[PDB]
Design a protein around this ligand. Structure first.
Ligand SMILES: OC[C@H]1O[C@@H](O[C@H]2[C@H](O)[C@@H](O)[C@H](O)O[C@@H]2CO)[C@H](O)[C@@H](O)[C@H]1O
Ligand SMILES: OC[C@H]1O[C@@H](O[C@H]2[C@H](O)[C@@H](O)[C@H](O)O[C@@H]2CO)[C@H](O)[C@@H](O)[C@H]1O
Lengths: 133, 133
C-alpha cells in the first residue's frame, strides 16, 4: 500500500517538502525517508513530550536490526494542532533539513544513498502533501 | 525511481490533488492513476497539439496492456510554461476530475475499483505536487 508516485525521483539535488497538520494533542511526529519502514536514512522525530525529550528533535537512521546513534536538536518551531512544513535535500555526505521558521539541521548520510524510494509520516500528525522539485 | 508515500491511501472518498509545471512548447502531457504503469483506471491526456487533437483532454483506461475507448473534453484551461493542478475523486461507478477552473469532468470507474496505488505523469510536464485528503 501507500501511493507509488513514479515521477518522484528523490535523488541528490532534489528538494522534498512535506506539509500537514499536527494533531490537537501530540507527543511526537516523525518524517522518515529511506528504503522502507524498517530501513531509513533519516528519521526526523519531533518530540513535544517523549520521555526526557521535551520540545526536542531526535534524528537517527535505522537498519533492519535496529536504530543507530541518535542526534538531538532543541530547535523546535512546532505546536500541537498547527500546520507543519519541512524541506529536505541531501548529498552523498549529508542531509540538509529546513524547518518552517528557517531553522536548519544536518544529519550524516550514513548509508551513502544517492536516491531514496520511501517516505512516511508517523505519530501524532497527518501528512497533507508531498512536493518534490 | 519513484517514491512510495506510505500515508497516502487513495481510496473511495479521498481527494487526490496532483500539481506540476507544463513545459514551454508543450505538445501533450498526461496524468495516470491505476495499479501500475500498464494497468490504469484513468488516463488524462491533455493534448495541446497531438495529431487531430488540439486543446483537448483525452480520457481513457488501460486493461492488460491495451487502451480502451476514449472519451474527450474541450475544457482546456492549460498553458505551456504554467503551473497546473487537478483534483481527482472517485466512487465505485465514476471518477470525478476538477480543474483549477472549477470545470469538472466525469469518467466511468470501468473496473469498479475501491482504491488505487499508482500515480504517474508523462509528456511535456513535470509532476511536482501530490496532495491527498
Ligand atoms: O532513535 C529513534 C527511535 O527512538 C526510540 O526511542 C528511544 C529513545 O530515543 C531513547 O532515548 C531511549 O533510550 O530508547 C528508546 C527506545 O529505543 C523510539 O521508540 C523510536 O520510535 C524511534 O523514534
Ligand atoms: O487512449 C489514450 C492513448 O491514446 C493514444 O493515441 C491514440 C489516439 O488518441 C486515437 O485517436 C488514435 O486513433 O489512436 C492513437 C493510438 O492508440 C496515445 O498514443 C497514447 O499515448 C494514449 O494517450
Amino acid at each position: 500500500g501507500g501511493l507509488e508516485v513514479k515521477n518522484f525521483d528523490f535523488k541528490v539535488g532534489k528538494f522534498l517538502t512535506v506539509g500537514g497538520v499536527i494533531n490537537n494533542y501530540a507527543k511526537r511526529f516523525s518524517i522518515n525517508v529511506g528504503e522502507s519502514t524498517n530501513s531509513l536514512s533519516l528519521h526526523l522525530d519531533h518530540r513535544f513530550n517523549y520521555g526526557a525529550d521535551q520540545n526536542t528533535i531526535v534524528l537517527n537512521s535505522m537498519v533492519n536490526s535496529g536504530w543507530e546513534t541518535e542526534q538531538r536538536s532543541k530547535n523546535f518551531p512546532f505546536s500541537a494542532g498547527e500546520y507543519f512544513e519541512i524541506t529536505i535535500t541531501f548529498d552523498t555526505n549529508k542531509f540538509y533539513i529546513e524547518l518552517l521558521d528557517g531553522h536548519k539541521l544536518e544529519f550524516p548520510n550514513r548509508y551513502k544513498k544517492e536516491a531514496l524510494n520511501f517516505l512516511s509520516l508517523a505519530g501524532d500528525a497527518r501528512l497533507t502533501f508531498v512536493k518534490l522539485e
